[PDB]
Structures are given as structure tokens and as C-alpha cells.
Design a binder for this molecule. Sequence first.
Ligand SMILES: Nc1ccn([C@H]2C[C@H](O)[C@@H](COP(=O)(O)O)O2)c(=O)n1
Ligand SMILES: Nc1ccn([C@H]2C[C@H](O)[C@@H](COP(=O)(O)O)O2)c(=O)n1
Lengths: 217, 217
Amino acid sequence: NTMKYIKAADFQSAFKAVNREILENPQFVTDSRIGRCNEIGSMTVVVDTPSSFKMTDPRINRISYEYAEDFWKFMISGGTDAKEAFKAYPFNTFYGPRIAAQLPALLKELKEKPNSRRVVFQILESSDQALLDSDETLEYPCTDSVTYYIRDGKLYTHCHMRSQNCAVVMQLDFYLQGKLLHYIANECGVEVGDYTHTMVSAHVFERDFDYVKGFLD
Amino acid sequence: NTMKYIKAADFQSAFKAVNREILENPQFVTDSRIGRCNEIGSMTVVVDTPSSFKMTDPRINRISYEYAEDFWKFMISGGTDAKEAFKAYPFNTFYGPRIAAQLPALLKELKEKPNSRRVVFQILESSDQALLDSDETLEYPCTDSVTYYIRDGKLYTHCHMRSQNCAVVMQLDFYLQGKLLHYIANECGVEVGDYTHTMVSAHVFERDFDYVKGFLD
Ligand SMILES: Nc1ccn([C@H]2C[C@H](O)[C@@H](COP(=O)(O)O)O2)c(=O)n1
Ligand SMILES: Nc1ccn([C@H]2C[C@H](O)[C@@H](COP(=O)(O)O)O2)c(=O)n1
């Protein structure tokens, strides 16, 4: 039966378990906007040790960590010049500027209101709906929001994904989300608890099945 | 140990299981913005049969269904005059007008783009952050977003809650979310699949423990 809740010690184990389950026990096999995929709706993934956001298996190589680190610097710096930022790799929907806008208010709430439930970074917003009936290629944000809260000296993170390509782009999302929760934790002078990753659509495209089978076992 | 994933046949069973688990196996016991509570972070709840949104146990009575139906009419009508709407019960953050604004674009995507992953109603948005450092009493939206998708003739729903009072207001949230997914399903001419309810903070205030113990068993 389809397992929808996956607890793992580190990002890699979570990553492999999620991919394994979508390949073997999908909820849907479906034609999507960009091709056929196996899909599991409303997957919940928990990572016990979120300092583990750089995975170690070199066979998971479709997102290089040279690229992922360049992407991190690009998005934490809140820049808009992606053409220049990625020239070594061949209205906007960049996450960086949105995180930058919300940082002062959210950090204030997080540091000053004890045990707050209100610290939510919006990534996807309703103004992005102008992309739906368009022929633009801009990303309609796959990340819906990231919630942070501090209890008893520890920072807990919940990233809610509208849409997640679990074989490829999830490698990048994990890296970026891991870096960001550590940035937030360091700013607040607290330690890290755990990380939770929900995805309304958790999918692997059929064109990537062989790649996935390459890093399982 | 704290159970964070709860699958139930109907809303009531889910409702009772969630409350039971927060009372008996909380992750945190914490001082919040509005008093002490038991709390479980990143709870995931699945309801198999979402037509069951009106629960039947009369002991769960802090949200009357007379009130809940009045609230439904108020929010689906996209009104702003809550003073008049609720005169029988003693910038805005109303959900209704936000749902109304997004309905045309989201319905279009849902009906016209097959197997879309993009149909997300934003409730909580970053402009609401102006409430954080304020002395207004307006609700800072507890509901983050509601995602809808259709596969093989069935409508699936994922409601992501930033913050959920599981003993009291969850009775209202379930009713409203149940009515809305059926409104959406009927508009699209499709049947209903299942409903998923994630809550970054799932909590019961200590002042409501006796009320909860009243409807368990
Ligand atoms: N941060 C991101 C951005 C995008 N995507 C992936 C998910 C989908 O495979 C595709 C988005 O397509 P759609 O808008 O149809 O969901 O990109 C992702 O996994 N993570
Ligand atoms: N639709 C809603 C609106 C509000 N709340 C509850 C959750 C919290 O108990 C409180 C919001 O407080 P805070 O902003 O501190 O999370 O109201 C809820 O459960 N459901």
C-alpha cells in the first residue's frame, strides 16, 4: 500500500525512501503539464537531523552542489540577475527577493514574541496566478510556504510544497531549505530541532525512472 | 510516543483522534500568545469521506452548526459585513473575499488544464504580516492555503493550517473546508476523493481540557 508518511534520520535517507515509494507504490500514474509521472498526493516527510542537507551519495548527481551553493548565494542575497549568477550553467518568481522582503518582520516576530505560531514565509502568493493562463515560462512557485517556530531553545521548520519533482529538483529544495533554516537558527541564537516537508504533489517523471533506479541500492 | 499522522474514515473520528493525541501525547506543553496549551507540531490528518463534515456527536457543541452554516454563507458570499452577518451571536482578514478574488482564475486552471498541480487558494498572504507588530485584534489567518487537484474524475483537497485550535475552532474549519471542497467539486462536475489537513501547530489549550474529555468516550 502507498506509504505517505516517511520519517528519516537525514535528508538522503528521506530522499531515497520518497523516490523508492513513488516508483513502487504510486497513488496516481498521470499525464501532467510537463509529461507522464508517478505521483503520491499529500506526502509528509520528516528529517530528524537537518544539518544533513548536503547528501553524500555521488550517484545523486543531477543537482551538483557547486550549482546548489551558487543557487543558495543567489537566493539568500535576494538578487534578480540570474543570467549573471548562473552564467557557468547553460515581475519575477525568484524566491530570494520574497524571502528578503519578509525577513525583517518575520525575524522580529520569531525573536520577540515567545512561542509564536505566526512565522510563515510565503513563497507562492495569489499574484502569481497571472501566470496560469499565460505563455510565460517563469516558474509558478513550487514552494507554497515555510513555517518556523521555536520551542524550548530549538528551531522547528515546516516547508509546504505545492509541487515537488522528487528525483531531481528535491535535491536542490532540500539543500536550499537546509541552508535557510540554519541561517534563521543562527540569527536567533538557537539550535536546530527537526524538519518537516509536506508535498501536495510528490512526483517522479517516467523519463527519470532509470536515474532513480541508479541511486537506489 | 507522539503520533503525528492520523487516518480516519470521517471528520468526527479524525477530530476525536487528534484531540485525544494532543491531550495524552503532546510534543510540547507551552505558553502561547493566548495562554497555555498542549501542542503537536506538523500533524497530518487524512479524512477518507469528506462529505462527513457535519459531525453528529452533540457533545461537540462549542461551534453550533447554526453558527457554522451562517459562517459558510458569509464566507462563500465573499461579504465584509460580519457585524450584520452574526448579529445573533455576541483591510480585513476575512477568508471570503480572498476566496472570491481567486475563484475565477483557479476554477479556470482546475477545469481547463488537465491534471494540474497549480490550483492553490492562498488565505494567509505576506501583507498580513503588518498585523504582527500591531495592536489590532484582526485574525492573522490561521489557514495558510487550500490546494485542489483532480485525477481520474475525483477532486482531492489539501488544507494547510498554520495554526489550529483542535478542540474548538477545528470544528468550524472542518465544516467550512468540507462545504468548500464540495462547492468546488460541484462546479467542476466531479466526484470527491479524500481530504488532507496539515497543521504546523496543532494545539489544545489547557482551559479546554475538560471540554475535550467531555466528548471522548
Ligand atoms: N522549487 C521547485 C520548483 C519546481 N519544482 C518542480 C515541480 C514540478 O515538477 C515542476 C513545476 O511544474 P508545475 O507548475 O506543473 O507543478 O517543477 C520543484 O520540484 N521544486
Ligand atoms: N480558522 C482558524 C482561525 C483561528 N484559529 C485559532 C488557532 C489559534 O488558537 C488562534 C490563532 O492564534 P495565533 O495567531 O497565535 O496562532 O486561533 C483556528 O484554529 N482556525
